[PDB]
């Protein structure tokens, strides 16, 4: 819930996942996200919706979109001696969707 640069007006802006409903979200550098991004992507990929409770606005928004993501392995080189789950930073709950 941000402020508009020109109209001095509040705006409820959903992320790329709520803005890509009935479309596709293309995510680059998928392995270098902070806590907020991981939580948002987890909710989107679990329930295909995003909740929000900010500044008097309590609502839910639809995020029925497909996700295509790109990433790089730990250390910058894939190690075939280990399972894929140990070559990437992503945990299992996000890697099972």
């Amino acid at each position: 819930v941000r402020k508009d640069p020109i109209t001095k007006e509040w705006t409820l802006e959903g992320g790329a996942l709520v803005l890509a409903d009935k479309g596709v979200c293309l995510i680059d550098e998928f392995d270098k996200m902070n806590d907020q991004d991981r939580t948002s992507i987890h909710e989107a990929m679990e329930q295909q919706s995003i909740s929000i409770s900010k500044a008097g606005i309590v609502t839910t928004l639809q995020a029925r979109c497909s996700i295509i993501a790109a990433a790089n392995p730990n250390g910058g080189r894939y190690n075939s001696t280990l399972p894929l789950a140990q070559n990437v930073s992503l945990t299992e709950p996000i890697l099972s969707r």
Binding site: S53, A55, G56, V58
Partner: protein, 611 residues
């Protein structure tokens, strides 16, 4: 012109019938014949309803044409044998909150309850200005008035400060012979306990003057009775101002009450009658008093007889000292519990939070160590860097209940060392250097480091707290859940007995109803326990005697040189602890001398806690 006099007469004959208020006129008047009490009387609207319904409905619905006549009648009575009026009783639909106040209620007498969110700086207001003319040697005077002075509307007058006399002689002000009256403006909001979650709250301004100008502080729960008014012109006078504005509204307060809640600054209070005092004195004679007052604390919990005795002693409290030089000796009692899960710890913390006259609750990782010690270096609108009170500052002369005390980090635990023993909070940071009072007591709960108490290991391996902190806690108790057969049968029967209980005036199967408890401030039941505690704490101060001196010095010396193992170390503080406990017990008996039994009981309690 004629209705005014008729209303004056109708209020005079209302006073004539009910003679109570007549009594309360000679009262604030014979005493002002050598703090001058203020000339405000309080009337119960229920009596005014049962006397004259029309006059009652007029006050409720049309105050501006009914209150000034009553004030004039009251002033006439006082003079014969000005005075202002305050109202209490039922208000029906007029009792509202900041959320439900609408344009339907403008120009009516209302009562609104909420949280005080923003007070102002009290200032004087000019009401009469005197002048001296030396050339003629005479005194003159001018009068001033404004919208918020009277309820009725009066044509504005051209306020102008006189500088020259009619004859031309120059004037000089006589500041000491003028008249000034205090004025404050406050803001009230909807309480967090009632406002819907996730929605921005609603506010209302209130204006106070004269003797109602400073009676509440920010963050308190308040109930204001006053008239809802309208002022100015929302662009109506102007030829072209706007089409998106309205009239400004506020409340002309005439009564303010502080309300007591949980985890709130205001302290509960009851009015003690002759019957209550007589009953307390009669009850204090029985020899098992310390057990009657002790088994009645949380009677739904099984056992823990000694923690309950400690709770009562902490509630009563000892006596502090102030030496001539300026030294200060602590007089409070603090308690720590370390226990296994499901040992009724948090249920005893909540009992204290609900029965103490003033207590504030806090969890562990929840509140930081600056949120407890009041390091609120902030800034106000005036620009003065100010300290905002905290949990321990607000709990001055109260109690602080700390749950999950072991989760509190050291950087947070070390801020409490000063408060628990020095009873002050000295804050010295950029641009600010001040000291506040934190004369509180602490009751805290925690669990071992291994999840359960390992009897094989040494206590220091389980409790895992510094000796510095452990010394400040007067009594440290250890509670263990040991699986038995005889004990389990008793504790199950008791628990199942509690879960089969019906409040009076209910039908088996009918759900019970819950409500918020906002009281009006100023085995035995809980109310009698509160009354007993208030009387004992307010009107008793025992003194030490030689017998207690001997018992305490014997016990301390014996404990210091011991071959046993203790849950906590022994220092000089322990001696003071023995003196505190003794005094507390002497306070329970309503005695002015700490006798020998008090000291013996203190010794037994400490020995049970330690060994």
């Amino acid at each position: 012109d004629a209705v005014f006099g008729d209303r004056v007469r109708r209020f005079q004959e209302f006073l004539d019938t009910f003679t109570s208020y007549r009594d309360s006129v000679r009262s604030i008047q014979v005493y002002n014949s050598n703090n001058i009490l203020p000339h405000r009387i309080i009337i119960s609207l229920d009596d005014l309803r049962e006397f004259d319904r029309s006059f009652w409905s007029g006050i409720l619905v049309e105050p501006a044409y009914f209150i000034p006549p009553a004030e004039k009648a009251l002033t006439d009575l006082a003079d014969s044998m000005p005075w202002k009026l305050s109202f209490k009783g039922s208000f029906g639909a007029h009792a509202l909150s900041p959320r439900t106040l609408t344009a339907q209620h403008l120009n009516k007498l209302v009562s609104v309850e909420g949280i005080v969110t923003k007070t102002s700086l009290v200032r004087p207001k000019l009401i009469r200005s005197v002048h001296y003319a030396a050339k003629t040697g005479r005194f003159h005077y001018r009068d001033y008035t404004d919208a918020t002075t009277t309820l009725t509307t009066r044509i504005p007058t051209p306020a102008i400060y006189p500088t020259e006399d009619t004859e031309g002689n120059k004037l000089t002000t006589e500041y000491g012979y003028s008249t000034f009256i205090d004025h404050q403006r406050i803001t009230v909001q909807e309480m967090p306990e009632m406002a819907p979650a996730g929605q921005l709250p609603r506010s209302i301004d209130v204006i106070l003057d004269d003797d109602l100008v400073d009676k509440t502080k920010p963050g308190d729960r308040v109930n204001v009775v006053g008239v809802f008014k309208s002022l100015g012109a929302g662009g109506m006078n102007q030829s072209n101002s706007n089409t998106l504005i309205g009239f400004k509204t506020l409340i002309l307060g005439n009564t303010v009450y502080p309300l007591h809640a949980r985890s709130t600054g205001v302290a509960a209070r009851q009015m003690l009658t002759d019957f209550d005092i007589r009953n307390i004195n009669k009850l204090s004679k029985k020899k098992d008093i310390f057990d009657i007052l002790s088994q009645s604390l949380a009677p739904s919990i099984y056992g823990h007889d000694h923690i309950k005795k400690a709770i009562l002693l902490m509630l009563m409290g000892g006596v502090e000292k102030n030496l001539e030089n300026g030294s200060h000796l602590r007089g409070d009692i603090n308690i720590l519990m370390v226990g296994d899960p499901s040992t009724a710890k948090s249920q005893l913390l909540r009992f204290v939070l609900n029965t103490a006259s003033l207590a504030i609750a806090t969890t562990g990782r929840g509140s930081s160590g600056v949120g407890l010690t009041a390091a609120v270096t902030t800034d106000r609108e005036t620009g003065e860097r100010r300290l905002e009170a905290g949990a321990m500052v607000l709990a001055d002369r109260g109690v602080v209940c700390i749950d999950e005390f072991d989760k509190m980090t050291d950087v947070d635990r070390v801020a409490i060392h000063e408060v628990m023993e020095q009873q002050t909070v000295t804050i010295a940071k950029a641009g600010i250097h001040t000291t506040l009072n934190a004369r509180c007591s602490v009751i805290a709960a925690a669990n071992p480091v291994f999840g359960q108490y390992d009897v094989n290991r040494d206590p220091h391996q389980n409790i895992a707290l510094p000796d510095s902190l452990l010394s400040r806690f007067d009594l440290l108790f250890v509670v263990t859940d040991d699986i038995n057969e005889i004990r389990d049968r008793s504790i199950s029967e008791h628990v199942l007995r509690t879960h089969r209980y019906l409040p009076p005036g209910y039908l088996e199967g009918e759900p019970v109803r819950e409500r918020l408890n906002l009281s009006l401030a100023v085995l035995v039941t809980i109310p009698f326990l509160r009354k007993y505690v208030q009387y004992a704490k307010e009107r008793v101060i025992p003194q030490l005697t030689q017998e207690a001196i001997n018992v305490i010095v014997k016990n301390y010396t014996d404990l210091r040189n011991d071959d046993n193992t203790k849950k906590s170390p022994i220092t000089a503080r322990t001696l003071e602890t023995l003196i505190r406990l003794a005094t507390a017990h002497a306070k329970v008996r309503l005695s002015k001398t700490v006798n020998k039994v008090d000291a013996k009981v203190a010794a037994n309690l400490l020995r049970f806690a330690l060994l």
